[PDB]
């Protein structure tokens, strides 16, 4: 039941993990719509770095598309493509 | 590999998943140890709500324990456990 040190290290430094991430905030121009849904799960540098200075970033990445439905408030509404960024490879830099 | 919408819709939609979430943030008034790893993983409530106006809650709780690194800047460090809350379930709630 006690997680061990080890455990805990490794499993909370610096990598890929899902991550549900705000369609506004990927897509702050599209200011007219709403989405549904309003968030989508993709897979994001999380975590911490050995050191307070260091920072948990991106070193490859890859998109993915979705069906998201585009909606008009109160006058429309439509299921389209759309593309997000994810992250492949996460490494510990400075900031 | 285009994700289709009701799997967008249903990975992404409130409830319980894994977040890295740092330690200081859950033990605010520490102000004697630093912590390795800085951060923990836990299942935390995320994700959206079919109400943009309603925010992701937890409904369930429980404790988890892991042992973690204390450290005395310029004293010591000492590996010992600490308890985190985990959300077993959520549900959207009023903001």
């Given at each position: 039941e006690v997680v061990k040190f080890m455990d805990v290290y490794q499993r909370s430094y610096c990598h890929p993990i899902e991550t549900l991430v705000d369609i506004f905030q990927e897509y702050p121009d599209e200011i007219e719509y709403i989405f549904k849904?309003?968030?989508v799960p993709l897979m994001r540098?999380?975590?911490?770095?050995?050191?307070?200075?260091l920072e948990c970033v991106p070193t490859e990445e890859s998109n993915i598309?979705?069906?998201?439905?585009?909606?008009k408030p109160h006058q429309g509404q439509h299921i389209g493509e759309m593309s997000f960024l994810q992250h492949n490879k996460c490494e510990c830099r400075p900031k």
């Open positions: 849904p309003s968030c540098c999380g975590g911490c770095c050995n050191d307070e200075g598309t979705m069906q998201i439905m585009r909606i």
